[model samples]
Target: KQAAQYYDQGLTLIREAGAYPKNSETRKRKFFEAEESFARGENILPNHLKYLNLYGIEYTRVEEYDRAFEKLFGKVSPDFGAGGEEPSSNAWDKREKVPIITLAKGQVWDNSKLPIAGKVGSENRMTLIAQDGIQRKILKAGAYIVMRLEKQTHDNPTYKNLGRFHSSIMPSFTESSLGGGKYKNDQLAINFYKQVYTDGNEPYDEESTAGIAKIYYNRREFGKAASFYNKIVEIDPSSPMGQGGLLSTYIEMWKEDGNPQFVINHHRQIKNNLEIEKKLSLHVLSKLASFYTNLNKKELRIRYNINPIDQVSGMEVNDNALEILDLIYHKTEKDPITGTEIEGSNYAEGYYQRGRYFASIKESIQARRFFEKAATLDPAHYLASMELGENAIRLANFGEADKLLNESLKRFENFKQSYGAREEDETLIQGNVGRIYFDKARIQYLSAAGIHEKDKFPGRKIYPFAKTRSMELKNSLEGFSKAESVQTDENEYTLIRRWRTPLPPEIQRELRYFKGWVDYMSGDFAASLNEWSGFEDEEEYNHSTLLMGKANAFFYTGQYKASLGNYLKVQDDMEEKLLNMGLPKPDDPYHQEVYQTLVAAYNNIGAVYEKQGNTSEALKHYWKAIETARKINEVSEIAMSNKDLMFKKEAIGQDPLLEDWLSPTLD
Candidate 1:
């Protein structure tokens, strides 16, 4: 009795210290004082369970958490039950809710002698009317809460301190360690609770199990989340939240690892879980439809070159987008919620998904219409607004694009602010906004370039609107640079990769390419060469395009050998592509770009030869250039060839009537 009295006093101090806020230094002193009192009590009654539990609680309050767990749960694992596997029987269905009743609000609980296993007798334990209105034994004894169960006298049962709560072995330790947000601390808390409940031989609680699974899910640790989710389904196969969480974890796993089989298995598993002909069928059906659409396009495929499918088999997957859309349309034509005939954007999300399907298939006109309908249906749909803006940009409808993009920006700000979004989400929004600006610059530059004709200038010179064009290019580069600035880490890079946005380094290369093009147009060949040189190491740039750009720059500067070398590289690559396609003939008629590039290479080579006073070689190439142009039936190109040959003949003091000086071959 004396030892129990001393242990109670120690617990009182521990509770008082816990009542204060965590930042209070006074509480720390009180906790340490309680620890000393607990030690004195323990000396009087060594290995006493109640004294040990009280000592552990007091120790934890003073931040000695390891000692607290060691004292209560002990250093070695206890035999709580057989295994961690879920019980086969439905434990919750048979058990009734037990109503708790205490004599007073501030009553102190001292039922430490309660057996670890088996029922405590009526004389030893209190009794109360369970929630099912039957008298049953109720156990409610914890150091922090002063409560116990007692049967009511009358049928109308009214009780004080009626509640149910999980008693944490070390509440402050759990909170403090988890609140620190370290991965190791998180693992420690999870493992601690797992052992605590198991070692205590406590009945399984679904809510508590779900709580642990959520912690792992939030941390993006899908592997551990899967195990808990698997345990949950084993406990209750009909559990909706468990099945939903399991499916969601699998989705995330597929997303992180880029495995097609994960999604395939998700569809297979969900089909069994979902009642397709019954309640809430449309939600899963629409999602499955979207999955099929994404699957056909390999939209889920990531990390290229790691796994290459055989191209020779011609085993391309066909579109299931339309087939799935038809199913969704039939089911959703009548509203499931209101049971009314659906019309307009009532199926807004369905329309939005269809728009995505169309957009993936490169049907921009159809995609724009679908997105427009989706936006009309849900005015606050940020995704629809963004897609509408992008579609308008593709159509060169800058005015509509600006309005939609601005709306999207407003919607995104509110959406993110409401949810207290993370830094990566913010970066995603910023990068998308930068893309809008970049597209605007591209449209303006292209429009300006279209207004100027190369025929009106000498030797296919720069556009007359060079200054305006340069400004647009510079503005576009600014947007690309801004987007790149947001992607400083691998987290943002992974987000970009998942989002299907051009990576930061790829955008940087684009900035270099445009900077070179802009300089080239401005007649600063030296500055252009510097910019193009920076892009040579960037693999994202097409080899032929880069070589062609270098060749143009070299030819303008009169570096004949360097110009000829680059032009030859372009010709070789084009020939290789044609040869790979089993069309070795340069004039295959299907290879239009190949023929055009070859003609340009021939004409340029002739110019280089004429400049070097190699008349015979120059004449040979001039004839070949015209012959290639005639083969492609390029009338304008033939005229240009004749004009170039005239220039070379005049420069070399050769007669135009020579047998090698061919007439303009139009036919």
Candidate 2:
């Protein structure tokens, strides 16, 4: 077979194995076959970057990450294999690839364990040297092999001579040697230097993807584990890592593909028919989803009812998300970082997970329910508390929402001001509180306006309440302003933000935007306009909000042409951000609000011309608005997925306060 064909087959073979039972000998056999196939593929196409990359992942699948890394990066060695009897005519001579080696403390393997086996060759046998002149040899590749002074094979003379071979600095070692007994020693260290890949706590030989997937899967993370497993398949389709990961993938694939009825059916089939368990690759979650989706459509349902609204409504229909939630919360089991059974996690961490997992599926209501539960479980869960508040506000549950949001901000402020015992959740706490206050202020003002409009013709008692509500909104905005300012500081690195340390440019821009949000809400229109305007010229001001802000400011200042121009710019900006975020193509619903806003802007441009007594121009815009509206409706009807579904609902109008200027109703 050609290298590519073998590579492809190699992946398919491994995927097939994951369906087998855990202890099935077939699974092990396929893993061994995959390992060999990968090597064969590499031998044929030595410089194939893809093959090279696959080798690393394959090594990781077998929990040989150290070896995998060595293959990608050269092995470091203090000794450089010096003073060997002349280099033998072993395959190691022709080996141009670098090896990863380590020098860890104590003995990882005994040299006398066994003769080198598997795919190993001569010239570099794994050996352990003990203090009493004993030598143990074993077979392995790429690992940290360290031994104490008492485990040395040579006497003081050999120890002194091998000093040049010290792979790394001895920070944990003590000079005192064992008086008599020999300590166990590792053999893999003989070939290379000790380069620390982890800061001591990172797993030595496990692939993080496989580990994370297994952890999630065993923990019954049918969704999360499946997501990670999908990643494994993308990286290494033919490996056991891609095949072995499952359960959630099976259920979810069936569920998401409108095959919920056949989920168990497909599961039984996969288990009974395919040798999946034997293939045992970690990245098959998505593949499972794919297979089940097609299988359902093939065996039972001949046609899909592609009703977007019905589909969305059905999202919460069959309690599929709920069942998945239960699966994640109950049936799933894992050895989490907390080291407890999944049941413990369900009670303790489940609440937080509710919001997080629901968010994954876009079931905002359910997510919020869980988030609220988490908050109730631990009001101090900064993320949960904050999300609970935000979600409540989103669902228009203002009274309950305000209470949760306020509590979150208040707790965060108390902790930050005290800087005492409360430091534990400070970063998340502070950031979340600031975000909550900002969202609350916007929602409150918007809700108040909505209420005032509804009540205007009814002539209800709306004297002090409206004024007070506005003041409250202003206060909320001010609080957010203060909190946002603190976080947005360029030099400031809060405890939580310390990880993934983003580049400086990104941080500075975020701070500026947050500050602008505060400024915009506080009636500092010019300052807000200026702040956002600076961002306007920036490449980052490529969102609906930013474009809307600029247009709003221009309209307020009577720059009608400029306002229309910016609104039009908003459409282009939306297209840009959407495409960048990984949309295959931009269309209506996908870019619904953008198109809607652009149409409104165009209509307004005509209106502006009309205000200037240009009827022809006004007519032109009116027609353009009609066309744009038609297009919006068309795209809304046909688009497979609308990434900005949430934001578009609120942005379909020309007026800052109105919903869709092209609607049949008129002011």
Candidate 3:
């Protein structure tokens, strides 16, 4: 009872101090005196956690934060359970949240008390994770891990204070030790560092001063981090330690918040620094190249998507990233400080990043050169390996695509084993491997379906009807089956986005529909209809590709209204998503992902109108389809599609139908 009264009194004093306005002398004057009340109560029931956190808070008022950090983090703390007011609580009666710092995914910090069968962690000291099954992960650095389970009814049974928090730090992938790592926050250990703000341009120590910058960086108090990093830069203007930190700090904030000027400002500051100092950082050069390229990519996505708008006309061959890479490539490695060795950016990442820049601009000749160089430089660089494989598929070099993709599969496996097995890594590798097989199948099916003019071989005729053992059709079937067998759940698709292009849920749904398209174009509309039944129970089927197939199947099989029903839902959309207020554009990156779909849809709709003898509606649609087709340089098959369907395989072996046309609509 005496302990509770003292603890409550200490809290009341602190609360009273908080009520004073910020920067008020009264608050500053009153704050320091509250520390003694906490100490007096802490002497009574030292183990009580609420008093300890309060005590920790009091330590902060005097700015002895190094002391506060240890008090808050280094010991066992709060919680009482359903067992009633501190009645020597049983195991189930305890509830708590534990925090641990990790550098990589699935990496347990050194000396972590992992609850174990022969591991370093056990609940004896501070239980890192209470449950054996729960392993905490952060995909990349910049966040600490916090874990908990079990409901809390605390906020006096009205609102709850149940929230998980992590202290984040900037990531340095190539290096091992994190900056301020666990102590990254508004407060880092040390009272003296804040005092060293001068022409002495100093620190609690120069090393610990950088630690302050790191704390600010991780906390997302970026400008403060910038101020300190700049302080180090002003003093040690030639070193990578300060300038590299400044560059990364600026770029990260830019990426987090949004703005090109952040990139521009960060670029000019370091570029001029490099010009003046004659000292170069290999990582900074490559890092800025990456920053510029990433910035350019983002601008394109935001601008083109924001308006009607990349081959991207109005997109320049600016190649600003290329200039930086060239500088790195041509850099001489003869000397350091004045004598000795230097390593330029000779690693796979430099090449890999350069390759990505070229690939984005459709300059694959140069892209493949860098990608191949990257893969050969580091055989274990799975990303470089994967890009080569993806590039192979983009061209019609079919046989090579399979072999490259196979090499990529093994590289990821070997890399995963060399590093610790991370859950998200496995999910990514598995899903991408699935995507590889699917892309291979899609290529085969695209050829077999005989729709794409580019794939029309010299002597090819209508297949499936010609031979039941069509090898292309066979491989297409086999590829999709392998994909289904290997693919992870739908939710895992989002995880793989780091390595794969962002795909729509509907477009990914079209993966299964690829099989249905194969069946439909093979003249078995019934089975194709059955194949599409997989999505029957799903909410509003919005897939334009499959809907086109579904509508076509219904039309060819003599069910006009069903065809109309499917076709009608593909509402007219804007060119480049103009006036596309909230709904998806036909060329919306997330939804459509196919510009040609705009041409096909209007034509398909026009054909549906013609079948119903509505010439007015039919003419309107055909004109719209033709206008869209001309704008985008895509073919329109809206006029002669049903007549094209009238031809029999027995009557004509291979006289192709009129190229530019659509379904039941002709003048």
Candidate 4:
């Protein structure tokens, strides 16, 4: 009863605090307080199964899975019925074979007898273990963090990994797993782990200790979560969870403090000291490049020249690199390592890319030649065939385009059976496939229109191929529409969709984003806008791109006033973070550049009105935001002195691009 009273009181206080604080982190701290109250109630009514269950649920609410499992079923299996009957879902399924450790309480090891290898209660931390092995640790709270690993030998880390480790083999869940069962996503494993281990006695570990930094990292208390995470990383330097978690926490801190330079400087030091010649791994490099790109673009800076797409494309590449780049008349190389003839052997793919690139620039003749070369290179490359087929359709070479497109279609049918496209890459592939028909139909429609313009003809020259092309385009659109429909229908990552299932909110938001993008591409702008708008409330998402798109939409529809308002709003918010928080500090390069584009848009809007001779309107918008920017700068100076500052002074002001940023236009 006391716990309930406290829980209610804490909930009230937290909810009330939300009115004054617009930052999500501030609100989350209040939730944590309410969570503590709920835990207290469970302590008072220890024997009450319902109370224990509710407490476990509360622990989950705060992302303390270990404690929830300990309180709910750490001692007894959920399926171990008091009377003989069917076991419940919470019971250990055959695949998982619940670890015996969860069945008992108390320290598994005597600290005096066996010296633990790592520190468990440091202020910041991460934990990494060999892919498969046993590593154990005792926490200062008299509890433990247990992680079991299984080595993966896959050449690639795709969705298959999920099916292998996920406890649930239900076909639906299994199909959704990554890489067709080669590697396991620990996130899935955690879900089942929380359910079975719900009966432990001590408190479960809330992410406050480690995992994702909270969405509301804007508050003072939330800063403690970053400290707690840092301690975990200190305990286990190699821990992937710890490393990834610590990295994210630092990123969150940068976002609020507005000191993106710190992050870049630290990474630069790591790169320079670690090894000048030893480039970062593809995945790691891409992540780093993307981070820099976003921030640099925000600040109207171009300091980082690395392009992630180029970096990723370079990975696992053999001698085919230059050839894939379609430099046939340029450089050519033969791989000494694997003697796979690069020039003659997969040269078709490169040609295809060249054809698309050329077409984009309206180099129709060059595009045609590349498309033909692509078709010849890989007689079986369906995409290449489709490109050639498209040209044929445009030229009224109906027989040729169909010849190539038809064969490619057959291969697509087979590929569909072999690997029913997963949601991750479905968009790219679907768009490619759908384009064949779209172009074909578009060619026909335009041809009819052209005849009307040049000759006296209104519709036709020879036959009904134009009508046929129209139908094909509709069919192609239907395929994409179906993919979007499925994503929307199954939204595996939404709160309402998985109410009983406790997925972290970030995961849920990701799920919504995927579904929303599909809807957007499929022409459901309203739905897409609605879904994307929800993300504005999520602190983890930096809304630079989204705001830009929204502004574009408003500008498109003649809502200049609204568009100007949102653009300025984004600029003000970003400037506040940059100037008032530690945004430009060392190790804080995340959103450093977004503020610039926001400002650029501000200038653009003013220019738009200025072009129409409305100086008053232009000045009003410009002055309002600049004033806000000044306030932001004042607040950031104060933020720099806050106890939450996490990096050394060396991490600040080193991006070379920042010095030259004054001349560039908003990109």
**What's the TM-score of every candidate structure?**
0.52, 0.35, 0.44, 0.29
lDDT of model 3 at position 455: 45
Superposition error at 131 for model 1 (Å) = 24
- lDDT string for model 2 (1-667, tens) is 5777666566555556644543479877876787576557655643343444444444433333344444332233322332244222212322222222332335454433323343345464444432222243433322222212112221221121121112111111101131211110112222221111132223221244544454344334567777776676666554444445544456544533455543444334344455353233112332332233223333343354322112222332223334334443434333221122334234434456446656755788777777767666544466677677667655657777778777876655433321212112222322433455555655555454343323321121122122444455445445546545544554432322322122234434554554555454444557757876666355534555555655655665667677667666765665455555452323534455455555555555554554455656656655665566565453221111111221244543332221112110011
Estimate every model's Cα lDDT from 0 to 1.
Answer: 0.49, 0.42, 0.49, 0.39
Flag regions of model 4 displaced more than 4 Å.
1-398, 403-412, 417-434, 450-667
User: Residue by residue across 1-667, what tens digits does model 3's lDDT show?
Assistant: 6877876676566557644644578765655555465556545644344444444444433332333443343322232122234333212112222222223334334333423223434444232232322222221111112211111111110000001001221121111231122332232122223423331234323444565675566446788888877877787775556776787676766655555565554455555535521244554566667666666454544553322121333323255577777776766444221122344456565787789889877999999999898788766566666677767756656567667877877875544322211111322232345665666676667566553435421112222244543445556788777766554434332223222333325436656566665675456777777887676454335655456667766766667688767666654343444344454444444333333455555666666676677767766776676666565444455334433343333453322121111211000
Model 2: residues >4 Å from true position, as ranges?
1-328, 331-347, 376-379, 409-433, 443-475, 486-494, 497-528, 534-552, 555-560, 564-607, 610-667
RMSD of each: 16.9, 20.7, 20.1, 27.1
Q: Lowest-lDDT window of 10 residues in candidate 3?
A: 156-165
The TM-score ranking, best first, is: 1, 3, 2, 4
Candidate 2, overall lDDT?
A: 0.42
**The best candidate in terms of lDDT:** 1
Count of backbone clashes for each model? Answer: 0, 49, 8, 76
Better of 1 and 3 by lDDT: 1
lDDT of 1 by residue, 184-248 (tens): 13333343345324432443545445546755765567888888877877887666456656765
Candidate 1: Cα lDDT at 537 = 51
- Model 2, C-alpha of 253: deviation from truth (Å): 28
Q: How far is candidate 4 from the true structure (C-alpha RMSD, Å)?
A: 27.1
- Name the lDDT of candidate 4: 0.39
Q: Write the per-residue lDDT of candidate 4 for residues 1-667, one digit (tens) a residue.
A: 7755764565454435433332367665765675566556534532333334444433433333344444443322222222145333222232233333321223232222212233233442222222122222322111112221111111111111112223222122223342222111334344333432243221233322332232222122346646655565566444433344444445545545555554544443333343321222222222333234234333423444332222323422122222324333333334321122344224554566567656655677888887778666644456666767766665656556667777766644433322211111111232234444444433443332332223311122112123443343234334334433433445332211221122224434544544344333344446645666677465313465455544544544455576566666666676666565553422333433444344445544553454345757655545543443353242222122211221223445311000001110012
